[PDB]
Structure 1
Amino acid sequence: LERVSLDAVNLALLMALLYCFDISFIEQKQYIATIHSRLQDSQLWKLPGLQATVRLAWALALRGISQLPDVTALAEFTEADEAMAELAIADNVFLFLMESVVVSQEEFYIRRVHNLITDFLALMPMKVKQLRNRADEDARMMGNEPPISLRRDLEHLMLLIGELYKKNPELALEYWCPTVLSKFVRQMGDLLPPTIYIPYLKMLQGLANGPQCAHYCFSLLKVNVSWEHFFHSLMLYHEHLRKDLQKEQDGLIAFLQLTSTIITWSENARLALCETPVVVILGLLQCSIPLKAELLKTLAAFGKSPEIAASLWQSLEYTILQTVRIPSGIEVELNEIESRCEEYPLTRAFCQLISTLVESSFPSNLGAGLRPPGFDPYLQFLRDSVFRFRTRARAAEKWEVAEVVLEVFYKLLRDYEPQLEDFGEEIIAYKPPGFSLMYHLLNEPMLELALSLLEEGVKKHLEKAVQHCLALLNLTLQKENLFMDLLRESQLVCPLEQLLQGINPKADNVVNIARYLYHGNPELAFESAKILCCIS
């Protein structure tokens, strides 16, 4: 195995080696004793990191084996174990674990490794404390990333957990299920050093995975560090940031990563976290921060399905409206959004939040007092966005923005119950988003952009974007008439002939659609089939 450092192939052997050390009892222990001695000698090899790991692993196991005292009495702990293990840590035994874990016969590997990971907690705690204390003292109040990372062995361990456990909830549950891991978590919660603290937050996020695990993580902070302390930290940072006008980004990014993970996988609890991080998160968003996008993503997670959207909409409108001066024209409104949502992350976050809020509802006469009211200006903003999208950098990025946009557009189409008409209403008809949505769609890069999604089709994620493109076109055809007659007159800039020539004339889209009926995804095929009917 030594005669491999990078070679991924090493992973194949880890199951055998992890389990082998696990079953040291089998060996004799004349043999085990000999290996132990040989390994201490073997500290000569820094170049082979993976030797260093495996040996360190053996030690983690050996300690347990020495439990039958014939062996243990014989040995002196400081010489026999701690000195060597410490040497291994120094020689990057944790780092390579992290690598094994990060770069994840799965059953054998997962089982054997999780046994490894756990052995380290229970048997090793002396080492953890030794390292933690070592780290706290070492740095002194221009540190380079390399200097920060040198001593970081404890944090690396936390990451080891994060990578290994992630997904896998199964494994993750072990932490939460009984109240030593649970001790481990409590212990980790205690480590105050900003870097340890941030990795602790990240590790827990990984642990939060199941709907079930997420629930425990909720309780962990709430009941037996509290959520309140967390928001407090965010609040404090906010003040420091603004009063002032990397370390913080690490901490904050972690704070958000964690809140996001749980809020997403939760239920009625969501409201509780919502009311509490909502107010604080809103305040943080006002500050520039690199981060803006991230809080928007978290905010979105908080947004509830029901009526009690209102606090969120106000925050958003207020948070676009506040600085901007709006003339009585449209452009000034666009400017408000453009000024605030300066960078790419800001926009993507914004889109996710908006997608969520627009899902099914918002307040009447929104923006009243400050500006011409209503939802319409937000859709105009998308002109800035998906108009632009075509000229992304970075396909992955373009797709990232395009998708939220399609989902929003589709939602707005569903947003009005067309059926009531075919088989203060006026005001309601004015307020719904379906109106501005149709207006923009008719604006022929708008139609084109939607159309190109169809022309160029097929990772799986991209496939979804395609389905949405079709579904939207179908929806438009079905109710194109409704908009022109009923909706447009009420609420009575301009009209239709443009999309048709382009869809109908322009042929490639028609042919592409034809090809789609066959290709399995029923959503794409069934919809493609419907469209041609609508076009005809």
Structure 2
Amino acid sequence: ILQTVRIPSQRQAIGIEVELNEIESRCEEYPLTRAFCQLISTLVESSFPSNLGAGLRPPGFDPYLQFLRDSVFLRFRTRAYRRAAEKWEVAEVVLEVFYKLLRDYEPQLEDFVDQFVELQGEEIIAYKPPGFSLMYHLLNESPMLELALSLLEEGVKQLDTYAPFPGKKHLEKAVQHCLALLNLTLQKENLFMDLLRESQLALIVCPLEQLLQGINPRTKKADN
């Protein structure tokens, strides 16, 4: 119902990655996507299996995170909405999922070791855990960090009018989880950076303390 196995002869996706982009993006109303985010939002607080997808693909969570990150979240601002509120109702239920995944994650040294698995005779690397995928996409100048910092800017931009607006409470929550994700990165960064220095992995990541001082491409200031 998410296609986590994409076949080399297959022109079309299958599942909600079609029904979002063909049906909900046609209606301008997004009940299937928000119920599917609310589904994942329960299933992380009852934990996911480490062997999820094993023997059909590399094990772990990142195929579901790719969908939330690159098919839902980075597209929530490009889509049109019949309910001008639902732009923010989608925004709550995806940042909740990321917040829970970064809350319940704790950095470990094996996260910085590439673990191999046998798939149909090939020796393939297992997916990195969702909290490390979130940390790597939050300790770089990512489109995820752009959309997050340009939500914190956009939240203040609406609140400094003091006005009511359709969907306001879900924007206040979307700003809430967006702040809480930064504060979880700051409360986990030194350990993630020191385990990267002990493990010698060929990655580069920058402190969030310093990425918050990146030149905001909207305002052309360091104003994050």
TM-score in terms of structure 1 length: 0.28
- 8 A contact 2:51–2:59 mirrored in 1: yes
Cα distance change of structure 1 residues 340 and 375 upon mapping to structure 2, 3 Å threshold: farther
CA distance in 1: counterparts of 2:137 and 2:177, whole angstroms: 17
Give 1:411 deviation, angstroms.
1.0
Give 1:442 deviation, angstroms.
3.9
Q: Which runs of 5+ in 1 are unaligned?
A: 1-319, 506-535
CA distance in 1: counterparts of 2:4 and 2:109, whole angstroms: 41
- 8 A contact 2:29–2:86 mirrored in 1: no
Cα distance change of structure 1 residues 370 and 456 upon mapping to structure 2, 3 Å threshold: same
Cα distance change of structure 1 residues 408 and 322 upon mapping to structure 2, 3 Å threshold: closer
SS at match of 1:371: coil
1:25-75 CA distances to partner (integer Å, 9 max, x unpaired)?
Answer: xxxxxxxxxxxxxxxxxxxxxxxxxxxxxxxxxxxxxxxxxxxxxxxxxxx
Give 1:420 deviation, angstroms.
11
SS at match of 2:137: helix
Give 1:480 deviation, angstroms.
2.3
Give 1:345 deviation, angstroms.
2.8
Cα distance change of structure 1 residues 341 and 396 upon mapping to structure 2, 3 Å threshold: closer
- 8 A contact 2:37–2:93 mirrored in 1: yes
Give 1:418 deviation, angstroms.
5.1
Q: Count residues with an aligned counterpart.
A: 187
1:68-95 CA distances to partner (integer Å, 9 max, x unpaired)?
Answer: xxxxxxxxxxxxxxxxxxxxxxxxxxxx
More helix, by proportion: 1
- 8 A contact 1:355–1:408 mirrored in 2: yes
- 8 A contact 2:139–2:205 mirrored in 1: no
SS at match of 1:369: coil
Give 1:448 deviation, angstroms.
1.5
- 8 A contact 2:155–2:175 mirrored in 1: yes
1:137-177 CA distances to partner (integer Å, 9 max, x unpaired)?
Answer: xxxxxxxxxxxxxxxxxxxxxxxxxxxxxxxxxxxxxxxxx
Give 1:384 deviation, angstroms.
2.5
Aligned position for 1:440: 137
Cα distance change of structure 1 residues 340 and 411 upon mapping to structure 2, 3 Å threshold: farther
Q: Over aligned residue pairs, what C-alpha RMSD do you find?
A: 6.2
Q: Which runs of 5+ in 2 are unaligned?
A: 10-14, 113-120, 157-167, 218-223
SS at match of 1:503: coil
1:399-455 CA distances to partner (integer Å, 9 max, x unpaired)?
Answer: 111111111111111122359999999999975321111223345321111112211
Greater length-normalized contact order (CA 8 Å, ≥ 6 residues apart)? 2
Cα distance change of structure 1 residues 484 and 341 upon mapping to structure 2, 3 Å threshold: farther
1:238-264 CA distances to partner (integer Å, 9 max, x unpaired)?
Answer: xxxxxxxxxxxxxxxxxxxxxxxxxxx
Cα distance change of structure 1 residues 474 and 370 upon mapping to structure 2, 3 Å threshold: same
Aligned position for 2:194: 485
CA distance in 2: counterparts of 1:504 and 1:426, whole angstroms: 42
- 8 A contact 2:61–2:130 mirrored in 1: yes
Cα distance change of structure 1 residues 380 and 421 upon mapping to structure 2, 3 Å threshold: closer
Cα distance change of structure 1 residues 377 and 324 upon mapping to structure 2, 3 Å threshold: closer
TM-score in terms of structure 2 length: 0.59
1:427 aligned onto 2:113: no
CA distance in 2: counterparts of 1:452 and 1:496, whole angstroms: 15
Cα distance change of structure 1 residues 397 and 373 upon mapping to structure 2, 3 Å threshold: same
CA distance in 2: counterparts of 1:353 and 1:347, whole angstroms: 10
SS at match of 1:322: coil
1:175-219 CA distances to partner (integer Å, 9 max, x unpaired)?
Answer: xxxxxxxxxxxxxxxxxxxxxxxxxxxxxxxxxxxxxxxxxxxxx
Give 1:461 deviation, angstroms.
3.1
1:490-524 CA distances to partner (integer Å, 9 max, x unpaired)?
Answer: 6999998983442799xxxxxxxxxxxxxxxxxxx
Cα distance change of structure 1 residues 426 and 409 upon mapping to structure 2, 3 Å threshold: farther
Please tell me whether Structure 1 or Structure 2 has the larger radius of gyration of its CA atoms: 1
